[PDB]
């Protein structure tokens, strides 16, 4: 055996650092993942706050560049694509096109994530007797408002930038999967292919890609596991 | 008269753009400032979605460079500094130094923007009878949470990345304000030098700057105007 290049530290639940599992594995890129244990209070002890001192994950070692260590989930994508995607099979070389990836991941990374989580509190994740579904409402119709940009952009453009796949779609794809299946399904009348064709195109072609399909199927599995 | 360099289209209350506005004035360059009325919905025209397709504020148009568009105001601060901040007066020439900058940008985009906001939402923002500060608690402890967490650095580090201001530093600079002065402010004995005297220290610091503090008195200006 020898020693993977990254390790990855994900959760079985959370969307976030499944972003970065996919890049990893559409790239062919090795790595171990660690579970870090937000139940034990895992990711606030001073074992991981060491890497991450938000104290959330997820958070990426590279222990082939001296362990260097990165944390944020869509700078991680970044890092990932500025130092191992020299052919830009995921990423963009012009400064023109660099700046628009970056403002998608920065629209994913404060428009998705934290409204779609918002959703996901409310909803489904805070403790039972705390879940809400009448505050929900304001970020289940958040997500629909997301949709909708995204829905007038996509309608226009086969992919976010440069008319061809980069980390700003990948990073995407776990929240609107997320979204479609659980904070929005049922909802007012939900039909994502009905309701938001052109986003409902996008997401069914990245979520049929081998490596994506992967790290989804990697993902049912690793929380069915917690259960054995 | 000379058509300044770009347009910046901001709001008097909305914290976001001035963040940029302080970019701006830091590097001494030339700009008009749009004020987008939110209460027409004017973010939501077509006139304004020709720009950003999300319909917020920020959204800048470089017009020396073929009036080139970006929206995301941390994407915008990085606009800012790789076209005209040669000399790294705000920012870093490094890869290491570039993705770890980048790093905090994004969990000041995810972590503080978002949060600090459904405080000031519940709290202050929102119309008056939908205000509400039992949800609003959940992210006023979130704000003190962000703040343990900067504490936690700046307590050994004198800025965010590379031991020099950059936009790291800059990015959360309005919303930090805006809680001390507001979201905060007389939640739980909250005493900002006494409770995060590192993130009191270096707050401070970024705001007695004087292109800073020009754009803080600035905006209080705006907002006073508003009723005029
Ligand atoms: N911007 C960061 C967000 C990372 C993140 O949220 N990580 C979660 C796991 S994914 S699970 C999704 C996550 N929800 C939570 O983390 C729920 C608990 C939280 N403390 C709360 O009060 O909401 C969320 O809403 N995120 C908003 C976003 O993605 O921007 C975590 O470590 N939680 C441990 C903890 O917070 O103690 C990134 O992209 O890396
Ligand atoms: N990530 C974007 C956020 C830009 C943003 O929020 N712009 C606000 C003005 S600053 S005002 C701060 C803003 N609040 C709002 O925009 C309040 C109304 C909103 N639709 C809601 O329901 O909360 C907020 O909480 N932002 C979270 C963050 O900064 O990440 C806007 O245009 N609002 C018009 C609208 O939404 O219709 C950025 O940094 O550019």
Redesign the pocket.
């Known amino acids: 055996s020898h020693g993977k290049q990254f390790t990855l530290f994900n959760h079985q639940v959370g969307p976030n650092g499944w972003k970065v599992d996919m890049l990893l594995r559409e790239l062919g890129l090795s790595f171990e993942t660690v579970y870090v244990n937000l139940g034990q209070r895992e990711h606030k002890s001073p074992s991981f706050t060491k890497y991450n001192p938000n104290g959330r994950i997820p958070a990426l070692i590279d222990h082939y560049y001296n362990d260097f260590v990165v944390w944020e989930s869509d700078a991680i994508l970044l890092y990932i694509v500025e130092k191992y995607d020299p052919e830009h099979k995921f990423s963009v070389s012009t400064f023109d096109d660099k700046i628009i990836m970056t403002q998608w991941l920065?629209?994913q990374?404060?428009?998705q994530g934290?409204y779609f989580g918002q959703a996901g509190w409310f909803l489904a994740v805070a403790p039972p007797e705390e879940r809400n579904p009448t505050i929900a409402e304001?970020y289940q119709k958040?997500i629909l408002?997301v949709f909708g940009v995204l829905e007038s952009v996509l309608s226009q453009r086969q992919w976010l930038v440069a008319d061809k796949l980069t980390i700003a779609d990948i990073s995407f794809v776990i929240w609107n999967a997320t979204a479609v299946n659980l904070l929005v399904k049922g909802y007012k009348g939900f039909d994502f292919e009905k309701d938001f064709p052109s986003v409902h195109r996008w997401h069914t072609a990245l979520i049929t890609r081998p490596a994506i399909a992967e790290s989804l199927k990697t993902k049912a599995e690793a929380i069915a596991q917690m259960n054995r």
């Open positions: 920065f629209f990374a404060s428009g934290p304001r958040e408002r």
